Amino acid sequence: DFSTAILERKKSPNRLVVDEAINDDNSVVSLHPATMEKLQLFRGDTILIKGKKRKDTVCIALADETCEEPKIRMNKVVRSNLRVRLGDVISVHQCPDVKYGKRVHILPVDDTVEGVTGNLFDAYLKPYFLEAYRPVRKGDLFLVRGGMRSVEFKVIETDPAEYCVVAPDTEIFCEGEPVKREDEERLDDVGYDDVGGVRKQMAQIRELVELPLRHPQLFKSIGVKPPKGILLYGPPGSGKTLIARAVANETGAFFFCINGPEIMSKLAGESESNLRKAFEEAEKNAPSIIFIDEIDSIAPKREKTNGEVERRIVSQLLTLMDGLKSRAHVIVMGATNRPNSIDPALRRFGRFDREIDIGVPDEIGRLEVLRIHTKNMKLAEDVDLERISKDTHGYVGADLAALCTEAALQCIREKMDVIDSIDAEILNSMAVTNEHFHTALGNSNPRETV
Amino acid sequence: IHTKNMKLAEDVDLERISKDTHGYVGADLAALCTEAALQCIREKMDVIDSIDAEILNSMAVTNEHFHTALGNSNPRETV
Amino acid sequence: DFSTAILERKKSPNRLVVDEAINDDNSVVSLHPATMEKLQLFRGDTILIKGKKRKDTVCIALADETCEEPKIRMNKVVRSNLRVRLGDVISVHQCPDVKYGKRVHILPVDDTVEGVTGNLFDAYLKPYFLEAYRPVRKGDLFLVRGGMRSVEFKVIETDPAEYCVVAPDTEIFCEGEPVKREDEERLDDVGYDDVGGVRKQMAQIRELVELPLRHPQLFKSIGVKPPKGILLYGPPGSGKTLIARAVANETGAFFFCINGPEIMSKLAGESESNLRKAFEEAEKNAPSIIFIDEIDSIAPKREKTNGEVERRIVSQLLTLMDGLKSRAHVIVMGATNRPNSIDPALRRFGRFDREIDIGVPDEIGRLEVLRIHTKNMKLAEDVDLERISKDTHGYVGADLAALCTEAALQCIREKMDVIDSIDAEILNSMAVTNEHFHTALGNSNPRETV
Ligand SMILES: Nc1ncnc2c1ncn2[C@@H]1O[C@H](COP(=O)(O)OP(=O)(O)O)[C@@H](O)[C@H]1O
C-alpha cells in the first residue's frame, strides 16, 4: 500500500544514526565518503538535516573515513538544534538554496550572560563567524567559548528568511535585552565531551545504559532483563559524579541524586523516608538514573556499622534495590572511593551487578582532561598542555581542573591591575601563559601498586 | 537452562563454554547467556523502531556473542 | 691542511646516526625524505652503507617522515652486517652498479640448524627472496623466520662478484655442510625488538646506560659522574632479566649475571668471594653490566635477615657498590618482584640511585608481546592477536610467551600424527589456529589497585 511503502522505505541511505563528533564545530557534520557518494553530496556542501519535534538545521557536510557508513558525526550543539540524542535517527537532505546572509539578528541567553559586560560582538560573534562561512537557521542556539566562560546565543532572524550562510558581507545585529531560556536545556551542560581519561570505562557504561534508557519499550518484547545497579570505583575527584551527570544528560534520563552525607545528616526515620521517596520519584519520572554519591556513607560493611538505625538504612537500600523492577526503567549508579568498605550484600545479583573501576588517568588521559578545562580559556603559544600532562603524574581529574582554574586566576591578577567589574572583550584577549601554569603547579595538593 | 528460549548457532559449543567458565556460579552463567543475547540483538538488528516475534525467533546467538560476553564477566575451592 | 679538511668535513649529510627500524626487513633501511633529497637518492634505490671494521652492505633506501633528518632506521641484521650498534655513525654512499644475480651460494650456520632436517630452500630461502629483489653482499649474514624457529644463513658467494640483487632468474645454491660461527654474535640474541609493553621504561633505561656504556671516554673530559645502580621492579616474568640482556647486547657491554639463589646456595665465605669476583671480572671486561637477579635473596631488609653470615653478604654488596667508581665503566642492574623487602640501604646515593617500575602490560603492551612470540610461527587468518590481548587481562610477558608456546605444541599434536623427527618444509607449512590459542587459554596460570 501507498503509506505502507513510505514507512517501509525508511531504510534509505538518507536515514542515518547520530554519533559523536571528533571535531567540535557547531556548523560541521561528518559523514562516510561512500555515504556522501550514495547521497550525492560533496565535501563543503551545506546540507539540511531534519530531526525530532518537527525541528531542522543546516550544516557543512564533511568526509570522514573513520565515520561509520550508516552513521553521522555531530557535536552537542547540532544534536540539540535537532531535538535528538546520540543513537537517534535523522534524515539528511540536499540544501541547494543557501544564499549568503544580508543581515542576521543574534541575541544571547540571559543565564549565560550573568555578570558579563561590554560588546558581545567583538568578544564572541566576530571571531566565531570570521571567514568560517557558517550556515545559520532561525530559532537555532549555539555556543561560543572564550573569556573564562561560554555564551549561548539564539538566532532571532535571518535575511534571506529561515536560513542563510553568514558571509563577510553579512550584517550581524546583536543589540537588545538578552533572551530568556525556553523548553531547551543549557548547551554548557555536562556531556561525554567533558569527561576525559576514561575512554574504555565510558564505552562500558554507555553500552549498559543506552539500550535500557534510550529504548525502554524494547525490553518489553524481549524477555531479557537488563542491569539495574552499577558501582563506580575510584579516588575522590576522578569524575564519578561527572560521568553520572554526563550519562543522564546524553540519554535524556531523569537525574535524581542521592548524597551519602545528605541522607545520613537527617533524623532517624527521615533518612529512610527520603531514601524511599528518591526511588519513588525516579520510577515516576522514568527512564531515570539514581546517583548515590559517597555510597559508603549509607550502606557501609556490617563491621563498620556501629549504630542500630545505621544498619536499618543499609537494609532499606538493599530492599529498595530488590524492590526495583526492570519494567521500572531506572538505573542506579553508586559511587565510592572505598570499594572494600562497602557492604558486600550490594554486589549481589539484582542489586549492583556490574562494577566499573575509574582509576587515575595516564599521560594521554591527563592531556584530554587539560584540554577540557582550557576550552573557555585563551592560551599562549608558550603553553604546552602535552608537557603539563607529562609532569602532572598522579593527578586526578579534579587536580588537573584545579590547576587550570588556578592558572586562570594567576592570569587575571598578573595581567589586570585596577578596573573597578571586567568586560567580555578584555577577558577574551588575556592569555594564560606557561608562567601562570608553573605558578599553579608550585601550589598544588595531589599512586598505583601491583 | 538459560539458552532454552534462545536460537543458537551450530558454531555454539555449550560444552566448551562450561570447560572455560571454571569458578562460575549459576547466576554468572545465567548473566553470560543474557549478555550474549543482548550482544546478538545489537550486532544483528540495526534500526527497527519495537521488534516483532518472527524476526526475534530467527536471529541466532553466535560463538562470537558468547566470546564477547566472556570478555566482560565478573565471576575458588580449597581443602 | 689536506687531511685536516677530510676529518673536519665528517659533518656531511652522508654521515648518519644508527637508529631502530619500525619495519623489520633485513634488506631495507629508512631515511628522512629531506635527507634523501640532500643525498640525491630515490625511494627503492639500492645504497651502499659502510660501517665499522672496514665492513659494508647494500640496502633498499626508503623515505620515512618519522625518521630524524640526521639519523637512519635499520634492523639488527643490517646493524650487525655493518659491525655497528644503535647510536653509532655510518656513511651512506650511492650504489649504481647493482646488477641482478646470476647465481648465489648461501649456507646456514650450524648453531641455528641443530636438529633441523629437509631442504632449507623450500622452507626458508624460497619465500624469503620471492619477488622481494633483495640486495645481497658476500660475507653477509641474515635471519629467516618460520617453522617454530629462526635460521641464520651466510652469503658464501655472488655472481656478479661481491654484491648483486637476488632476482627471479637468480640461481640459489644451498647444498653442503653448515658453516661454523666465527667472530659474530647470534642474530637470534635478545634485542630491544624482543621486549614489548615497556616503551617508556625502555627509553628511560636506554638514556641512563647508552651514554656511559657507548661513550665511556666522554665522561673523562666531562666532570659529571653518571649512574651506577638501577633497580628494576615488577612481578615475576615481566621481562626484568630480558631488559638487562637486551640492553647489554644492544650496547656491546660485557654481561655478568649474578643470581640471588646461586650466590646464597654457596658455603659461608664462598658466597662473598663469588660476589667480589663477579664485580672484579666486570671491571676488567668493562664497559660492563652486572645483573643481580632476585636481588632480594641477597641483600633483604635487616628485619628479614635471620642469619649472621646473611647480614655479612648484604654488607658485602653495599661496599662493593660503594667501592665501584664511575671511571670503572660498570653499570649494576638489580631486579626484584618485592621492592619493599629489599634493604633500604641499597637505595642510597652511590649505590642504586635510580629505580624503574616495569608493571603489568596493558592491552597495547600485551599485543606487542604476542607479536614477539609468534615471529617464528605460521599463524592462520582466523588468528586475532588483538582479540587475545583484549582477553589476556592480568597476564605478564611470560604468561603471554607461555600461551604462544602452548598454542604451538597444541598445533604440533593436532596437525601432525605419526612422522618418526619432523623436517623444516613441513614445520614451516603448519599454521597455529584460533582453536589452538583457545585451548592454550583454557589451561593457563596467570591485579592493580590505587
Ligand atoms: N575525568 C575527568 N575529566 C574531566 N574533568 C574531570 C574529570 N574528573 C574530574 N573532573 C573535574 O573535577 C571535578 C571532580 O569532581 P567529581 O566529578 O565529583 O569527582 P568524583 O565523583 O570522582 O569524586 C568534576 O566536577 C570535573 O569538573
Ligand SMILES: Nc1ncnc2c1ncn2[C@@H]1O[C@H](COP(=O)(O)OP(=O)(O)O)[C@@H](O)[C@H]1O
Ligand atoms: N616484556 C616482555 N616482552 C616479551 N617477552 C617477555 C616480556 N616479559 C617476559 N617475556 C618473556 O617471558 C620470559 C620471562 O622471564 P624474565 O625475563 O626472567 O622475567 P622477570 O625477570 O621479570 O621475572 C622472558 O624470558 C621472555 O621470553
